[PDB]
Structures are given as C-alpha cells and as structure tokens.
Amino acid sequence: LIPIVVRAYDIYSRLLRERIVCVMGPIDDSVASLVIAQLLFLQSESNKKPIHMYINSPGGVVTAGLAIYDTMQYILNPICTWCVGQAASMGSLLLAAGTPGMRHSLPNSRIMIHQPSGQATDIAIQAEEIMKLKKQLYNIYAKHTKQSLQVIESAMERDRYMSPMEAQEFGILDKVLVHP
Amino acid sequence: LIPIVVEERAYDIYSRLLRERIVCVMGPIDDSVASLVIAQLLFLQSESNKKPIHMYINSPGGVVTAGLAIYDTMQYILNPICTWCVGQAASMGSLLLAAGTPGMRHSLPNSRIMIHQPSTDIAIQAEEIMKLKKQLYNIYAKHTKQSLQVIESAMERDRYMSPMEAQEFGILDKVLVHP
Amino acid sequence: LIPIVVEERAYDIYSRLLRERIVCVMGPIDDSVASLVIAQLLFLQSESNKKPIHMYINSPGGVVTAGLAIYDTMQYILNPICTWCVGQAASMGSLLLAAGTPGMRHSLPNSRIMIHQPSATDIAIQAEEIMKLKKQLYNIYAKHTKQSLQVIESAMERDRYMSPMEAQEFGILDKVLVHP
Amino acid sequence: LIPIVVAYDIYSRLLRERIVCVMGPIDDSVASLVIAQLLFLQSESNKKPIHMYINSPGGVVTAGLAIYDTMQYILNPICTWCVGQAASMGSLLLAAGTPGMRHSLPNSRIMIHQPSAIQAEEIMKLKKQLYNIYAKHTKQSLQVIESAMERDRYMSPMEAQEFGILDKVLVHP
Amino acid sequence: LIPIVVEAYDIYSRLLRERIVCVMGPIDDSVASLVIAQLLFLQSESNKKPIHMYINSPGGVVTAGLAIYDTMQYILNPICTWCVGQAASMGSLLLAAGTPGMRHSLPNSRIMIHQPSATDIAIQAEEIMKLKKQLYNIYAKHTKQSLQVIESAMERDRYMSPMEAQEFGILDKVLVHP
Amino acid sequence: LIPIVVAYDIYSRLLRERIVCVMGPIDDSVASLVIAQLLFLQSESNKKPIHMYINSPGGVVTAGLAIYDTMQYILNPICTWCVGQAASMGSLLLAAGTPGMRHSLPNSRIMIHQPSATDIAIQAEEIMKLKKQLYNIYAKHTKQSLQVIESAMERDRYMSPMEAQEFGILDKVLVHPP
Amino acid sequence: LIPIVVRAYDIYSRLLRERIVCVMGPIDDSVASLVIAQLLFLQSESNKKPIHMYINSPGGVVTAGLAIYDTMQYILNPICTWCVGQAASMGSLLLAAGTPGMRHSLPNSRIMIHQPSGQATDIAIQAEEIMKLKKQLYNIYAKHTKQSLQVIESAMERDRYMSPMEAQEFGILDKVLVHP
Amino acid sequence: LIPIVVEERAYDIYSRLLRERIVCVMGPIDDSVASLVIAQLLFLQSESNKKPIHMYINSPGGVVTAGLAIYDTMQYILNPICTWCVGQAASMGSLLLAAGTPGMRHSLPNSRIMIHQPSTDIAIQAEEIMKLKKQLYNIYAKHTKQSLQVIESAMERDRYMSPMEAQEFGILDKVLVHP
Amino acid sequence: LIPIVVEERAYDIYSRLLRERIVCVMGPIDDSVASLVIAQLLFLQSESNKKPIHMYINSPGGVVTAGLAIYDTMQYILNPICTWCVGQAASMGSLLLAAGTPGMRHSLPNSRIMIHQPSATDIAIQAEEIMKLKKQLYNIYAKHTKQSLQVIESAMERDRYMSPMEAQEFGILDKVLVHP
C-alpha cells in the first residue's frame, strides 16, 4: 500500500529526487543491483551534489554488499550514510564507508560489525575462501575506522551491538544527532 | 519495487540503464535471463552497431546452454563490449566476463572470479556433459590466450581469484577503483 | 521486469521484437506457448504474406501435440520462415528448427541439437497412440532432413546431442555462422 | 507476458479478427469467457462467420455443454479449427461447427472417447446427451457412436472426417 | 495400543476366538482381504457354528464390499450381522447379507443405503451403472423388495431408523438387551 | 493390526493353506513377496496345488510379468481365484492359472484393458514391445486369436465373471463350495 | 505383511537359508550394505556351495552397485544370477557378473544396459568424473560379455531394452529357461 | 528388512557382522553414526584388545566433528584396525580409511576415494571452519606421510582417485581383487 | 538398527554401555534427553554410590533448563563423575563437561570446546528471565573453572571454539589424552 505524492510520484520515487538511496532490510544481489543503479544514476545528474544513503539493514550476502561498497568508492559524489534502527554485519560496513565527517546515526540505533555464523554466501564456498572474504572485511573496516587490524579482528569476534556513541569512538560514524 | 526517474519521459531505472547502453547480468543464469539479455544486445545493436555496449556482471553462474547462448550473441554482434564485474562472477559468469572486447574487460577491486564449474536443463548422459565442458575449455582458452591443459588444471581448483590474479590469468584487462 | 524501449512510442522489448518479425520459442513448449506462437505467426502474415518471419528457438522440448500445432501453422502460412537455434534445440525444438524454410535454418556456433525424444502429452495416453505420434515425428523429420525413414528411426534411438555442424550435415539446418 | 500490436494485445487483436480461442482444459471460467465473446461477435454482426480455434484435452462436461448450447443459439456461421488435438469435450465443440466449415490441420489428433461429485445415474444421463450430440453432427447411428466412444484411442484428421466429426483437412489455404 | 487379556491374547485376537469378525471404519481392499481371511478361517474351524459380524462402517470401495459379500454367500456357516453406530452404503449391504432371521441392530444406530458420489481407478459411465445395478439386485434379493422400490429408496439421501430398516427388510431384530 | 490364531498371524496361516494372497496394486515389493511364497510352497511339495487369491487393480507391468513367469516356472498346478476385481495385470495372472482351475466369484469384475506404472520412464518402442508381450500371454491362455485380443483390450470396459469365462479368462464361476 | 514359515523364520530369512540373496528394486548404499553382508556370510558357511542372486532392479547408485560387483568377484563361491521381470542399468551389470554358464533369465524379462540420464550419484560430482565412472562400466561390461569396447559403447548409447534372447547373444546371460 | 541368521542363537546379520569383529561405516556420517561406531569399537576392545578389528567404509563423508570423534577413538583403542573401502570413501570417509593400522588399509578395485572436502553441526565463524580444516590437513599428512602443502594442494582438486593413485598417495596399502 | 551383543544373555549395545556405568549425552539436549540421563544417573547410584560413573559428551547444546536439570543431578549424586568430551562440547555440553569430578574431566585429542551460548528454551521467554539464566550459567562456569566471574562473562562473549589444551588451561577439563 505505497502512497502517491504530488506530476505525481510514489513516495519511493520521490525519495530518489531528494538524492536519497534507500537500503532497508537484508542485502542480496537484487538489492545490490537496485542500489548500484541509483548511485550511478545520481552521479549522472551531478558528480558533486551529495547523496544520502539510508541504512536499516541486518546484513546479507557479502559479495552483494561488497558490490555496493565498491560502487560507493567509484562514484565521485560525497556520500552521506544514515543509520536508522540498526546497521549490522554488511550494513555497518556500508555505514562506515560514507564520506569522512558525514556518517550519522539516530540516537536509538544499534550497530554490529561481528559477522553472523539469512544468507551470506551465494553458492557453496570452501573453508579457505570464507577466510579470504573475512580478510576483505578486516581491511575495509580498518581503513574506514582508522583502527588497527588487531583491534578490528578482536572487536569482530565479540557477538554484541554498540550504541551510536560506542560506534562513534570506534570509527564507524562521525555524528549522533537528535535534530539538525 | 522499481523506482521511476525523469530525464519529458518517465522510465523505470532499468529502462534507463538500457538507455545508457548498459545490459545487466545479475543473479542466476537461466533461459529467462538468456532471452532477456540477448534481446537487449540485439536492440542495442540496432540503435548503432558501432557504439560500445557495457555489460554488468554479478552472477554465480547457472544453466550452461543459456550462458553459451549469451556468449554466442556477444561474439555475433558488431559492437565492442565492455564487461564489468561487481561482487562476483562464478562459473558461466566469469566466461561472459572474459568474453568482452579485448582491452575493456574490467572488474572492481573487491570482486571474486571463479572459473571452476559447479557440482542444468534436463539431465543428460556422461558423454554430453563431457562434450559441453570441452566447449568451456576452448572458450576460456580462446579469450585468456592460455593453453588448454593450463585451463583444464585451473578449473579443477575449487577457488576464487582476486581481480588481480584474474588479470594476470587473462580473464580481465583492468582493475579500477575510480574512473 | 521487462525493460522499455522508445522509438515516438514506448515499447516493451519483447513487443519490439514482434515488430521486427521475430517470434520467440524459448523454454518448454506447451499449449500456452503454442497459442502465443500461432497467434504471432498468423498476425505477422496478416501484415505481409511474403516478408520473412524469424523464429528464435532455445527450447528443451515439450508436449508433442502442442509442438505439432506450431509446425502445422509454420506449414500453413506462406511466409519464408527462418529458424534460428540459439543455445539448444532438443526434442520438439529441433523439429521446429528443421521445419524452417530450406536454406534459412541457422544455428549459433555453440548450440546443441538433439532429436532424441525424452523418456510428454497433456492427458494420460495409450501405447498405440504414443507410437502413432512417434511415427508422424519420423515422417516430419524424414521430410525435412531428406533422410531415409530408417535413418530417422535410427539416431533418434541415440541418447545423443549433435553439434551445429553435425546437424547441418544431417539435414536439420543449413548454416552455422559466427557473424552476419 | 503477451505482446502488444498496433495498440492491442495479441489476444485482443485475435478477437477483432472474429477468432475465439478455446485452448487448454475447459472449465466454467473458460466457458464464461468463450460465451461472452461469442455473444459480442454476434452483437457486432449476425452474419459474419466466426472462427473457433480448438486445442483442448477436454474438461468439465457442464462447461463444455454450456459452450455448445451457445454456438447453437447464436445465428452466425461458425468455423471450428483443430490445431494439435481435440479430445473429450474438445472434439464435441469441433464437431459442433456449421456443416461444411469444420476444419483440422493435418497433424492433429481427434478423440471422442470420454475420460474415465454426482450420482451414478447422472453420469449416465450426461453421457446420453453426449451420445446424441455426436450422432446429430456426425450423422451416425447411436450404437455406432456408443461403440466408438467406447474405444480409448485417437483418430487421424482423415479418419475423423469420414466419421463425420470434421469436414476439411487442409495444408495450405 | 490394544490391551492384553489373559485366559494371553490381544483383545482383537480374543474376539476372533469368539468367532467375531469386525467391520469397523471404511472398507477398502485391505479390509476385505482381512475380513475374507477371518471368514474362511472360521469355516475351517467349524462350518456349522455361527459367525458374528460387527458393522460400524460409513462405506467404502464397492468391489471390496462385493468381495466380502461374495465370501459370506460362499461359506455355508450361519452368519449374523450386528449394526453398531452406523451402517451406510457398503456397510448396510453387508448388514443385510446376514442369514435371514439373524440380522440385528442396536437401537440408536443409523442405517443408510443411498450411495455416495468407491475408487480403485477412475471408471467409465456405463461401468458405474453396471456396478449400481449389482447393488440394486443384491439389495432386492435380501430385502425381498421389488427392484423399483430399491431404486426409489436408494435415490433418497437420508438415514433410516433401525425400526424402519426392520420393516424395509435390511435387518430382522432391534434389541436393547440379550 | 493383524489378528493371531492358535501361534500364527492370519496371513501366515493362509500360507499354511498353500494360499498366496495377491490383493492390491502390483509393484516390485509385491512381486518379491509373491514369488518368494510360490517357491516356498514348491519346496514343501512340487505336486500339491497352490491357491492364488486375486483382487488387484493392476500395477507395474514388469512386476506382473515377474509373477507370471514364476507361476509358469513352478511345477505345482495353480488355482486362481477372483474376488472383487482383477484388472490389467491382475486379470492376466487370473488367466494364467492351470487350465480348468481358474475361478471367479459371481460378483467379480474382470478387465483386461491397460491403464493410460513402471519404475523408469521408457520410450515408445518399449511400451509397445511390452504390449505385444501381453498380447501373446492373453491369447495363449484364453486361446483367442492375436487380433481378437488386441481388439478387445482397446475396449474401456469391465466384464462379468461369465463374460470372462466365455472369452477364456476363467473356467468356473461358483457361488457355494463344490 | 511378511509371512512366517516353519523353529520358524520369515520368508525372507528362509530365502537366505536356500543360499538366495535378494536384490529387488533400486540400488543404494543400504541395499549394497545388506547384499554384501549376505554374500560374505554365505561364503563363511561354504566357499564352494553356489549362491543364487535374484535380480529385479531398475538400477540405482553406481558406486553402491559397483560395491556389490566388487564383492561378487571377491568371494570364491560360484555365483548364479537370475533376472526376473527386469534388470536395467546397474541391475544388468550384476546380472552379467554371474559365474560363466550360470547367468539365467525368465522368459518374459527386460534387460537394459543404457545408463539413465532415481539416483546415480551420492553427492555432487564433476564432468570428468562421471566419465571415469562410465569408463568403469565400459570395461566391466566388455569383460563379462566378451564384447569389444566399441560394441559396448555403441550399444549403451541406445535407449532400449533387450529380450532375454537378445541379451543371451550379446553376452549378459547364458540360459533362458521356462522350466528346470 | 534385516534378515536373521543361525550359527544355538538367532542374530540379525548386522549383529552377526559385529561377531566377526566387523564394524560397518555405510552412508553419511553424523552424530548418530559416531555414537554407534564408537560403541562397537569400544565393545570389540573389551572382548580382546589385541585381535584386529575390520572397518568397512562406503561413505560420502558428513559431519566433521563426528568423523573426528570416530578417528580419535580409532587412535585411542589398542587393537590393530583394518580399513576396507567398497564403493567410495569421500571427504571424512577417506580420512577414516587412511587412518587404519599401517599395512592393513585396503580397497576393492572399483572404489573411488576423495579427499576434497565438500562445499555440518551448527553454523560457525570463518576462523573456526579454517581451524577445523587444518586438523584435517594434519591428520591426512600424518597417515599419508606427505608434506602439508602437498596435502593442501591435493585437497583443492574436485576429483576422486582410483584405488591405485590412493595407494601411491599414501591413503591405502593394498588393492585386492581376491583374498 | 542397534546391534546386539552377547555375554549368557543378549544385550543391545547401548544397554551394555549402561552396565559399564557409561551414560551417553549425544546430540542436542532437551527435556527428553534430560529425563533419560537423570534416570540413568540415579539408577547407577542405586547399584553403588561410590563406583565412578562415565559421561560421554558429544553435544552441540540445547535447552538451558533441560541442561541445568542434568547438572543438578550430577551435583546431587555422590558418585565420582568422569566427563569425556568426544567430538565436540558446545554451549550446555561444555557446562556438563566442566561439571565433572575434579581431576577426571577428559577430552579426546581432536575435540572442540565452546562456552559461547547460541544467539534456547521451551516456552517463549522474557528479557529479565534470559539474563537471570545467563547469570547462573556464569556462576556454574566460574565455580567449576575456578575463574573470575568477569573472566567468564568475557570469553563467553567470543564466538570462538577452544582446543582441548585451551579448555584444559582455562579450567573446563583436566586431561587430554590419546591413549589410556
């Protein structure tokens, strides 16, 4: 039951006019394909006007999440990340991949970087190869939070969520706002 | 739910991707995908048979004959084809990736490329699956410019490659971070 | 989601294929697929009875009477019917492929062509009727491949797939091409 | 999805050609659809012939009888066409065409044998209706229809023409 | 599970020793096979000692009910029938197939002869008429009613009282106590 | 629950009567059990007759031929009995009894028409090759011509016990013990 | 509903006393484990008394069928094979593996050596490796029917059944009996 | 349906196999199989801790920790253990096969041996599955007497070996046709 | 099928295990598993209250109250309880393993020991009650490992498995042996 706003759009097509790419729910190849297209389209309108990326996600397929991350680094626009409700697993990696100084979170959000043990693989993968994927998140997290590799590997072995202030000091987000 | 963009006409974002001469290959490859992909490749040729066409690949593989149908159409049309790998391209997905126009096969830094065949259509006999696998042997060796047994060995290995190993191996030409 | 192309008018890409006089026979063939193909075949003739009609065949087979229904329409209309095998043409697919206008039956370089029938039909069927069906499959195959009736009874007993070059040598198609 | 011709969809264009399709199993939903178009094509013209495309394995008898009564009610000449097969109730509509205008394409299969909650006496009562319909349009005696419908087999289009189910077996116009 | 009685049998094997054959529940080929074997076993014990049958059945496959009916008419033992709870469709045909004067029913039972709308395969129209005509003749032979009266009463989708079924001919005695 | 007689279960005592029970659809499991009892009953005596009880709707053709071949292999004379029905493979086994010892009860239903399964999906020439095997067995035991058999089996109908007797499927139609 | 015969056994335990190993139905690891135990037990009673192996099977897992074959060659007893009803795929390979001159079939049996295209693999296997398994049946069939490798490979490409007389001339069985 | 044999006692054929000091390992390996196999290995030791025990292996693999539990019990008891491979022994199945007493690891001529791990218990983390795989690396190298990386390479290969290659590789000692 | 052993009397091998004073805790632990273990525990004590009792633990965990029910019985009875970890002991499995008599908690060389609880119980449960349960898990773990309560709160936050040597160093078991 999606509404229509006023030439008349639906509320989700209107969100894209305000340069807002929506990432709600589990991440798969279909979500990654839709998100990457919105980013590439938004750069075609202007490669300097900022883009806001709303994240309320529990995670999902890693390669699908990495495709969004790789596209976030490709486009030249300033990328603003907003954590609403929760950003866990791959969701917190996209949250931490925003433009430095523009990664926000709402005051009552939860943030998880631990990886779950409901998909995460597309096909069946071998023992050495989930380790290579985990090492990829090890370096991406360390690069965007400016944390050491050992601190990152240690923190990701603990099954717990952080408050936006804990995530701020760790390096996932920059500002915790209740109001503009 | 597919959003709508305005650039006066109103397209869905995927009808707008086809406007950019961009053909998406996301997900498992079956006869439904092969019918959709081939149609866009034939349409994009009709608009202009010399402008390049971009193929985005994030696929785990799938039906072999459908992936071979796309590949044949890729070699049939006259446009230079740029391949782009985001996320992953495993089994038949890496074959289409390596089948791009030489010099314009790209991948993004965190993609995973697998050429090991998994384990499609109706079940067949042992001589037919072995016949099909040798076509995958020849096609890979044709575009990687590797030896046959070098390909046959690398395909036994249950493993993915980083975009860089796939570049030295001959599946890719460029690994980009930024334009 | 089926994409949209623009001339001016907005078409769906499959509807644009029909304006190029291309009739797709993709996937398993049943009565619903037969209805669509026959409807498109008869419409393309009403526009012009001499302009060629293109048939895209990527099929693993299907119901015999449904596949025969199409073949009956391909023989009825006066248009030159170019058959194109892309991917594979098995069981009822190769019969339609071999039923194209002589000299205009093509195949793409990596296609597989089988004439072996699978080990069906709409309602449960008797012994004498199944062999009556296979006997008219022999006659149509022998008519269009110009082969002996027993050479069609043979080789159809072989659980085997053919190359486009074998299928060209045997009489199913006339050309196998890489480029136009 | 069904394509678009010029702006019509291919099955709406087939209706503009005065062609009514009866493809697949016949039930009350299909019978309601066929009857609606049969009355519309008569509403457009009561003289122009109407073409019926039959590719059916049969279906519900009361639904097939519903179509049959409508073709007898309407005043238009009706051409039936068999493509693929016409089995059980499907061959009854095929034989229900206007005399001299019942066709079949060469490689079709015609079945009049009926496939093996109402009482037993109602099954026999419905069957006798089927017997009389077949005998009326085939000009065959009742015991010939009863003995032939008893045989679990399909016919060639040439066999079905001599029996009286159809009139024309053509390859080209 | 079924309990164990000591005299050590399970109770259903003990009803066998009392020459009681149970026809409880729906009738299929598995029930007919079990019932016929119990009948033929009791004739081998003594062809003269009566056999008691307990019928609490909603009906079932017609050919299975005929194999039971043909087996009781085969053996020469005196066969009683006892309607407990309900005897509908094939159940009431067997109930009426008892030895004349020895077909009983308990007072609060329901007896039905109208046939439902019986499948091993899907059959043709004349084959369900051929089968129904067998039910007509079997009912008329044991109820001593005219064939027309059978066709009328079987067309009514209704249940009979054990009192009504007595004067119709389906049973002989409606008792509360021995 | 199968009752117990005195310690046998009723189906084990049927085997002691030299009776082999073939009730229900015929598959490879039914064929294995039936063949096992036929060879056992031959082990205890190669000349005493064996009794076969047939209430079958048909089943797998190769399993039904597996039984038939074993009925022809053993040296014992075989009485076949039809109760309820004998259809498709069931009527072929019924017809394959010892000449003059194939019986049926009066309310049985016998069909030789084959249904429109089998362990694997097979080809056209194999399904028809199997039908010719049935053509020869039916003509052999009914002593009818090949054309008369292949015509009559394309009829979708059942026969009465007397029709099948005149056709050659069975010999005696009994109501009470001879 | 398995009967009891007379000390009292069940009819299947009695079959083993007559030195009859029963192979009915599709073949899996459970059937192979049960069959191999009966063969090894029967050799422990006497390594010279013959063993009869009843076969009414449509096939099954290849490695499970090969385990029975390998055990048939291990034990020293004369092995008699009996085809009843049908022996297809792996079933006909065990039928052909009997002691020379002791492979029988009942007069109305069907024999298939073609391999189906309902299991045949335990796990998932690669393209080259089904070829190695097929080459194993290629040599086993040729060794026991004394046929050439080319004749064996050709005959196994045809989807058809043979009569016991066809199978006798080919080399699967030695005698076709109606009576001892 | 398990038959009954007489040799006076009445056993089922599998209770008679345990009488021969024969332990069967057929089918997928889970905690139910590990509980059954370990119990027989411990019982057969109690009857006599020096008589050999025979293990028949026709398994496609399965749960790793259950297959490791059996292997540990194999090394724990004091009896020499003969392993026998019929049909196949893939993944954990070949590990138990190679874990027999040196000199008595056999296979029949038409068996297939796979040491490539497939793709068990609850799902785990990437460091734990990698930790488990290295125990399979050490155990295989211990009984094959091969190098670690030689094992690690051979385990990438999606392939089976004939009993003869498995013999040169160090998983087997003897390949028999007849006693 | 559970095999049969013979002394003389015929036992099923699992019943023979109970006569060796061995109680198996294999698989997931629920109320039905708790009933069996407690019943076997109390019976073995009725025969003798000083003879050791052996507990075989190959468990991935289960219900907390069901697992606590066993631990309560292990503390109640007077017998020396030797715990044996074979394969794995995770969640409630390691708690029973660590609850064995001091000096008699063993593990086999290739076992995995986890104390991390999974991300349950019989009926749907509230927040305060789940933490009340984890708090008594802390107390039992701290009592038997002789570790600090916070050292138990830590490390239990780590989605991690331990070796038998780590579990010995931490206090879950006392010995890790290859041979008796």
Ligand SMILES: N#Cc1cccc(CN2CCc3ncn(Cc4ccc(Br)cc4)c(=O)c3C2)c1
């Ligand atoms: N997966 C994917 C992916 C991710 C990052 C970069 C690329 C490279 N490609 C190559 C071809 C191309 N062509 C046009 N544009 C502009 C545009 C305009 C509108 C829309 Br709607 C979409 C794109 C591009 O940005 C690119 C970048 C691929």
Ligand SMILES: N#Cc1cccc(CN2CCc3ncn(Cc4ccc(Br)cc4)c(=O)c3C2)c1
């Ligand atoms: N499977 C398929 C397939 C794949 C490759 C080539 C062909 C050959 N065919 C034959 C007829 C034809 N006719 C028109 N065009 C132009 C066109 C314009 C618009 C659209 Br929308 C699609 C195509 C063709 O490209 C071809 C090629 C078949």
Ligand SMILES: N#Cc1cccc(CN2CCc3ncn(Cc4ccc(Br)cc4)c(=O)c3C2)c1
């Ligand atoms: N199944 C079917 C089928 C197959 C072959 C031949 C026929 C015969 N029929 C009879 C009536 C008819 N009426 C009009 N046209 C032209 C037309 C115009 C638009 C569309 Br859209 C479709 C057809 C015909 O071709 C025919 C041929 C039936």
Ligand SMILES: N#Cc1cccc(CN2CCc3ncn(Cc4ccc(Br)cc4)c(=O)c3C2)c1
């Ligand atoms: N079931 C039904 C059915 C079948 C046959 C005949 C009838 C009788 N009815 C009664 C009323 C009626 N009113 C208008 N028209 C013309 C018309 C115009 C457009 C459409 Br669209 C449909 C019909 C009629 O034909 C009839 C015939 C009922």
Ligand SMILES: N#Cc1cccc(CN2CCc3ncn(Cc4ccc(Br)cc4)c(=O)c3C2)c1
């Ligand atoms: N369906 C069936 C059926 C129904 C009625 C009659 C028959 C005929 N048969 C033939 C052979 C036979 N042999 C022995 N007895 C005695 C007996 C003893 C114990 C048990 Br337990 C079962 C039977 C017979 O009654 C018959 C009758 C078959």
Ligand SMILES: N#Cc1cccc(CN2CCc3ncn(Cc4ccc(Br)cc4)c(=O)c3C2)c1
């Ligand atoms: N399928 C099957 C089948 C069918 C017919 C004949 C045979 C041949 N076999 C071979 C070996 C054999 N050995 C012993 N006996 C006697 C016997 C005794 C008790 C039982 Br219990 C079962 C059999 C045999 O009859 C045969 C006949 C197989």
Ligand SMILES: N#Cc1cccc(CN2CCc3ncn(Cc4ccc(Br)cc4)c(=O)c3C2)c1
């Ligand atoms: N899979 C399996 C299989 C198949 C063929 C041969 C072997 C080798 N084994 C080794 C140990 C062994 N020990 C005792 N016996 C005799 C026997 C007695 C009774 C029964 Br019951 C079972 C066997 C043996 O035959 C063997 C042969 C394994």
Ligand SMILES: N#Cc1cccc(CN2CCc3ncn(Cc4ccc(Br)cc4)c(=O)c3C2)c1
């Ligand atoms: N999981 C498990 C497992 C695996 C290997 C070793 C052990 C240690 N345990 C400890 C207690 C014990 N007590 C008696 N015996 C002898 C025996 C006698 C009959 C049967 Br039946 C089973 C065993 C033992 O072998 C052991 C070994 C545990």
Ligand SMILES: N#Cc1cccc(CN2CCc3ncn(Cc4ccc(Br)cc4)c(=O)c3C2)c1
């Ligand atoms: N849940 C439970 C449970 C757990 C711990 C303690 C108790 C207390 N109960 C009370 C009554 C009782 N009565 C007899 N015995 C001895 C015995 C003998 C044979 C078997 Br078999 C089992 C026990 C007891 O140990 C107890 C202890 C309950």
